[PDB]
Amino acid sequence: EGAKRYREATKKFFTGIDVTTGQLFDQRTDITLGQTLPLVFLRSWVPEEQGLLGPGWTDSFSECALATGDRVEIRTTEGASLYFALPAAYTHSVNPDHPDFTLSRGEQGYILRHRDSPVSKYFTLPHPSPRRWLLTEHRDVYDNRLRFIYNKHCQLTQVLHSDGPELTLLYNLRGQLTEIRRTDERLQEVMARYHYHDNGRLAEADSTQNFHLYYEYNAQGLISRWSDGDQTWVDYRYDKQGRCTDSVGAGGFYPVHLDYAPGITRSTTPQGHTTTGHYNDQQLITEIHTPCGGVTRYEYDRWGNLVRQILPEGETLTLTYLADTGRVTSLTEATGAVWQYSYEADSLQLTGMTDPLQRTWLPQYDEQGQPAGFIAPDGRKTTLTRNAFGLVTSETDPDGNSRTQEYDKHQRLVRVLDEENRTVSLGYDSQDRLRSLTAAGALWRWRYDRHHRVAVSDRPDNQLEHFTHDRHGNLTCWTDARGVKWQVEYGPFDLPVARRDGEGHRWQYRYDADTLQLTQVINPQGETYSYTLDADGRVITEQDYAGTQWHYRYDRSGNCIEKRDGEENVTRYDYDAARRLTTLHTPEGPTRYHYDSVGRLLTVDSPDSTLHFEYDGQDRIVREIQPHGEIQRHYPDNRTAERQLLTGHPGRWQSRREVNRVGELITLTLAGQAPLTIERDDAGRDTGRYVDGGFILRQQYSLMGQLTAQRAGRNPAGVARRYEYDTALNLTAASDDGQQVNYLLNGNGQVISVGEGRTLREHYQYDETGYPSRRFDGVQEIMGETLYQEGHRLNWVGSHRFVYDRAGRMQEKQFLAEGCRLALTKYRWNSQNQLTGLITPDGIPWEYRYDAFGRRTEKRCIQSGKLTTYLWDGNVPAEIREYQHGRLKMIRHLVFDGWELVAQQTQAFTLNLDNRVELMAGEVQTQYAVSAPTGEPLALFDPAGKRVWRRPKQSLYGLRLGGYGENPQLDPGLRFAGQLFDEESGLFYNRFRYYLPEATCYLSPDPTGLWGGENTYRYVQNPTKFINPLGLAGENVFIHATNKAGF
């Protein structure tokens, strides 16, 4: 037939070119406006079609309908038309091959609507001369409109949007469209420009909001070369039948060769690796063969609905349909879980979904049939409200909490009022660019360049930050409020090839030609980090800056089934058909995972521990079983939670938390004690905690949200502190009781020196890579020239020499004094997680055990009888117990609010009779904490308000350099956020890695890789403004202090 099936553009497979036809796919958006319904000028390439922009180019404004007396054809902006049979005996028609569209008869012409959209298109203007009907408007069910106005001689001159926006089209004497201008409330802004070759084919397309592109054509009127005009281009060569055989981009990117045969298309790279398609007579892809092997197969209904998918290992996903509706009723996963759907009879709109656990959700619909909330499985309704224009003005939860929105006369959102009656106010330029935002008495403003990109930001503090974009919209330079410049450079495809710090040091990147994945990083000291890719683009080996290597192997479907490190340790993985990890094999044994029908973990079994979980209804966890204890969460209410810990000398601990309708803790209650009240500001920051007639804490914040003061005590000595900040928001000074400390920083915000009363206490220097290593003094003098081996691995630190393992772990530490004999500290790493495993100091050994999540469970020393056990409530401890000679010394129950300690209870046991009795069981004592921003506890207070413990004096990077005060036994054991102190070794325990304070570094390389950061052994850039709470990736403690160009 003289037709081609319509495809939805998500069912098409591309290389470089549509594999099924050898046809170039180009589709570019040039304008985008409007608030209620969108006004979008989009153009696409279809060589044998015409419209605005001349031969070959067609666009959203030139859609039309044709009617051959009883059949109607709609010419959409895709490569094919829609066909409908509409006799004079019928009001509406549907075609099973594109069942989303319905065509209905109109007053004059036809009306086309897509099921899941509110917008309908009216082809109701006769073109004077099958019969051609022009597009005349779009209309919402809300009677919003977008009107197309034609002059005499049937040119489109204007497009009017009922909100306000309004476009004028302009033509030259040859009728060629040359410009589109926005002509709206005395505006004259030019929105796009077009230029043509002498033959009238489109030569250029300059778009204010988008890109400037150029086009060249071969002698057969087919595209030969498009370019950015600066560094990007792709080149195309064609066969005698119009099909594309070769493509090459700039820089050697995307090199493809295509071979065509009837039913089969194979595409090959310059290396000879070949992908193979198969497709059926409807141009639906049936098999894909990848170059490493592996065959994926698809099977279709007679109307081209996908019914079955088989992955190359045999995972089979099946579907079933409601005969001709095109509506899916069952989806069966490869694990056998069945999902079920049902639809309304009169109109094919979803009335219910059932999941494999027999929970049912019911969608709800307003008048005009637009969604209006849902009924949850519990029977609890959520509702929505809409103004006369269809904009959501109210949303409501079954608790009665509600969120409210208000709209300008141009239907722009101008005020958002949230569930806690905090308000945000917005402001707009005449061109609808977001000009202003008022959030909490802080006012933000922005200015824009001629391409509608942010030029200047004007912060609440009256500071100016400047942005410079290239013509393509890549942020080439950022200038912060100190005038330091951060710069980054872009290559052939807006891939960044280099970036330069404010100190001026430069980094470089290299990309894979076939896939544009990152394959190399060059250090400012010339060291290199590298990936090697498979034929399928999988990473099969990576190599570290120091030259450590890892190797991987994969299965047919793409899962990773083996890892080999450089110590010859082979880790293996087995997966279920849903790609969940199901077994882990290690030199130390198997670990087994078990799941339910829905993907919820029920049991992890491991060489030395077992975890169990139970869930209740809303996928809250209600029980956990761990080694050493249990947790039982009650949840009596939507805004309450009660936790009980049972451990065992049987012990129990209870707490209750209450929440302020927006998720923030506002009260804490410990069983035997009067409650603690937490106050919240309009930004949700904690401004104070108090116990009635007792402890009170008060805190102040700047308009940039940084903490500027703390005061605490028996309000009616405590702590009394102040902070000062730079204009780039680095901390410059801190003071307590007048003892001011001063920090000075280089052009990276790294502390050069610490002065405390004009005396210099500490100073530091940094190398070209940012490692906090070169001459430094905190407690001893560290020299810079013997600090590192080959790749930021430690060589000499004072009188200690370090030896490293073949796998890049630290293996020994040697105190080579030359006056004393050998002192050796030994570490015994395992393989599952580079867990420390064991340690031998100058004498007595110590051993550690871990859970199945990487969370330490024990710490034992058999020689002296010391054991420490831990119970965990998530990413932070819940209970700690400490034993010697088989009896308790201490127990700590701890409550956290984020990474910041809020309260602590402690019982202290001691035998006094020297008889087999656990004597003098003491009384629980509650302490309330005051903490620094980066998570270090500063002081602890009695509920009555008396201070009972105070932090010793401390170095920038954590070294203790004062003495212990009163009550050293009440020290919680916490350092920066996420870390615990090990006094036997002087190491700070992060979850996945161990930190050495004396060297500012971790003992082992990053568990993830370059995702964690470019610096594999560095802890953090600045201990006073960053935290690293898991061992994986550092983050800013305050928002608005983040680097906007990236790092």
Author numbering: 272 to 287, 290 to 402, 409 to 927, 943 to 1010, 1027 to 1357
Quote from the publication.
One broad family of bacterial polymorphic toxins gathers multidomain proteins with a modular organization, comprising a C-terminal toxin domain fused to a N-terminal domain that adapts to the delivery apparatus. We recently described and characterized Tre23, a toxin domain fused to a T6SS-associated Rhs protein in Photorhabdus laumondii, Rhs1. Recently, we characterized a new toxin domain associated to a Rhs element in Photorhabdus laumondii. This Rhs1 toxin, encoded by the plu0353 gene, is delivered by the T6SS, through interactions with VgrG (Plu0355) and the Eag chaperone (EagR, Plu0354). Tre23 inhibits protein synthesis through ADP-ribosylation of helix 44 of the ribosomal 23 S RNA, hence preventing protein elongation by blocking the GTPase-associated center.
The Rhs1-EagR complex was purified from E. coli overproducing FLAG-tagged Rhs1 and Strep-tagged EagR by Streptag affinity followed by size-exclusion chromatography. In order to prevent Rhs1 autocleavage, a catalytic-null mutant, D1338N (see below), was used. We then performed an unmasked refinement to 3.72 Å followed by a local refinement on Rhs1Shell and obtained a resolution of 3.17 Å for this region. In the high-resolution cryo-EM densities obtained, we could build de novo an atomic model of Rhs1Shell from amino acids (aa) 272 to 1357. Rhs1Shell is composed of a continuous strip of antiparallel sheets (residues 420-1262) defining a hollow barrel, which is closed on each side by two plugs (residues 272–420 and 1263-1357 respectively). The C-terminal plug is deeply embedded in the Rhs1 β-barrel and tightly closes one side of the barrel. The N-terminal plug caps the other side of the Rhs1 β-barrel but remains at the exterior. It is composed of an Immunoglobulin-like (Ig-like) domain (336–421) preceded by a small extended domain sealing it to the Rhs1 β-barrel. The β-barrel and the two plugs define a central cavity of ~28,000 Å3 in volume. In this cavity, densities are visible but not well resolved, confirming that the C-terminal toxin domain is encapsulated into the Rhs1 β-barrel but suggesting that it is highly flexible and/or partially unfolded.
